Amino acid sequence: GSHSMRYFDTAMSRPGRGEPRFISVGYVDDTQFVRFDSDAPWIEQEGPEYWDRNTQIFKTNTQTDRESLRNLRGYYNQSEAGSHTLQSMYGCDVGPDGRLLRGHNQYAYDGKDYIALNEDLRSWTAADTAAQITQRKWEAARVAEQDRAYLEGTCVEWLRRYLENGKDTLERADPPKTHVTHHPISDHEATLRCWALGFYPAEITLTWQRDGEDQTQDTELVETRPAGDRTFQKWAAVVVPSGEEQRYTCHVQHEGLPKPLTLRWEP
């Protein structure tokens, strides 16, 4: 199916505790493939020239981000006392044919959106007056054309290569293993919990229906969570009146399943 490559970058200042820590992690879908940290199978196949080029770009990125953090403190009239965070997230999305669906290149400062490259890969959206300064500088320096070139070229090219080299895991969707548990809360009510375990990728839809009606408001949904062995887990629960369990159906949709599942409590 469709695939994505993304790098998730975090630069964090720490006044009095050295220079800002910089970490860049690379993913193909929900699979981390690389980590570069200033505090430090299918990928090692690449060779030394690949490694040397990536580590050198990472070192350059660390210096650019350290200077951006200095600039940001000034743009927001902040003191040198506090810790601040600049985040960058970029990459490409491709369809089954490996063709570009869209590119991404965005930034956040202190957890707030700062500036982002638009879907057109030519123009910027600045969140505030400080980001309008960055937009003006980046328009003058033709930064979008450089980012576009990576997003349309390099990103798609390398993503295609990684999917070929890592085909046995990257191209394999592992279906959820599912079951429904029953937990009496009182003599009048019980919790029905619908489980999904060992699935990949993380994207999944878990729902409960009562008489074929979606129970969106009465369903407790936990966030999808990593198991630690590449797979993910999720559960959805509903509180049901004792004896009415059979009116409830859990519905599961996932890429690894040819047909969705409909599950009920099986006493």
Partner: peptide, 9 residues
Amino acid sequence: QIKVRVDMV
């Protein structure tokens, strides 16, 4: 493949 960042904010 990592992308270079040469322009500061």
